[PDB]
């Protein structure tokens, strides 16, 4: 399985996987930005907001694609716990351009460190690696077994039904909710791609693994 970081440096567990309400709301974020109330700041402030957005997409990007890997919450929560610390500085240096740039470089590092720890736990769970790949396999099989198949979105559980239909007997599909969840996600991708939207290719590590070779 292709990792986000090829030779992962060992990852640490802080046992923070059960934390909830770690994601900052838009109101909370806006209160932080409103502290940067100066013309000289406005330019970099825009850069800052972009990073936070990228940051959020990166975090959920991991949960959407790897919720099957146990340590996924740990990695996700550690990201937002660290981000909470960066904001302590932001709140004290709201108009310090250089420091705001530094905070931006730190968010990248945080993301990079998450990609690293992710690649590490995946490289410690061959089982998961196989099952993930099998899902990309069974989803590719779906790219064909759906050519002219009728797919009605706006109606209940069409996806899981089409998954239970095409593979409802597979041991993994039967015992692993996370395996099923990847398959269903795939049916939405197969359709959305076939409807003139190659954007899907680079929307996630799953979409990228399925729409290639």
């Amino acid at each position, epitope marked *: 399985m292709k990792l986000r970081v090829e030779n992962p440096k060992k990852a640490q567990k802080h046992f923070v996987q059960n934390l909830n309400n770690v994601v900052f709301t838009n109101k909370e974020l806006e209160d932080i930005y409103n502290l940067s109330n100066k013309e000289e700041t406005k330019e970099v402030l825009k850069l800052f907001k972009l990073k936070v957005n990228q940051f959020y997409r990166h975090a959920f990007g991991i949960v*959407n694609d790897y919720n099957g890997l146990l340590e996924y919450k740990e990695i996700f929560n550690m990201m937002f716990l660290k981000l909470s610390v960066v904001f302590d500085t932001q709140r004290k240096e709201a108009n310090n351009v250089e420091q705001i740039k530094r905070n931006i470089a730190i968010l990248d590092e945080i993301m990079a460190k998450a990609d690293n720890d992710l690649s590490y736990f995946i490289s410690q769970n061959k089982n998961f690696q196989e099952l993930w790949d099998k899902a990309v396999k069974l989803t590719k099989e779906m790219k064909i077994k759906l050519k002219g198949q009728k797919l009605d979105l706006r109606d209940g559980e069409v996806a*899981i039904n089409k998954v239970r239909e095409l593979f409802g007997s597979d041991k993994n599909v039967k015992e692993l909710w996370w395996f099923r969840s990847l398959l269903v996600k795939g049916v939405y991708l197969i359709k959305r791609y076939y409807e003139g939207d190659i954007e899907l290719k680079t929307t996630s590590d799953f979409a990228k693994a399925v729409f290639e070779d």
Partner: T-cell receptor
Amino acid sequence: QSVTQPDARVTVSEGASLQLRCKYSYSATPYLFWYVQYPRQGPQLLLKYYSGDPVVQGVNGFEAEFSKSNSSFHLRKASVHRSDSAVYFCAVSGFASALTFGSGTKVIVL
Amino acid sequence: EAAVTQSPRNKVAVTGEKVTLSCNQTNNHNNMYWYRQDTGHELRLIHYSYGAGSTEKGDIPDGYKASRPSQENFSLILESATPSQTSVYFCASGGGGTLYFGAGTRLSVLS
């Protein structure tokens, strides 16, 4: 208020044509949706725009155009069947895949 | 049976009472949301969850607490009900781009 709807309540005599106005704000990689909610019910997917053909091919003779230019996602239908007397909400997808709905326009077909 | 199953359908609570709303989704979806809609307005999310064990705050969490004990259930909790909470609540499911809402629940806080 990423998305905005200026039309509170728009009434149109049956058979006619209707156009619900919707302009967003995310102005980046908009994931625009339209939802319809008939009385005593919960919003239903009316039509959605991913990223491709700016003209969204909805259902029940519905269509919406995504003009990054005017940064709007207006909704319009050819003939306004009286079976369309309900409220309409346009919205955008969030970071956690949550929908942020607009004010909402109520349509009363005569 | 419904894809998204809310419950109860109607609820009348005395100001101060503890109210719990349930939501079931058999779509094998990971994401689940809770919105409240005041008559004549849009849906505003209270809390959301991206999987079992998870729960995050939405645009209007004050006064509410959510719980996601299993992949299929996401309940909304009202510790001490207040008149301002009188409204209609909708639950939603998600895994594929769009959100699949439920019937809705009418809650009235008296006193």
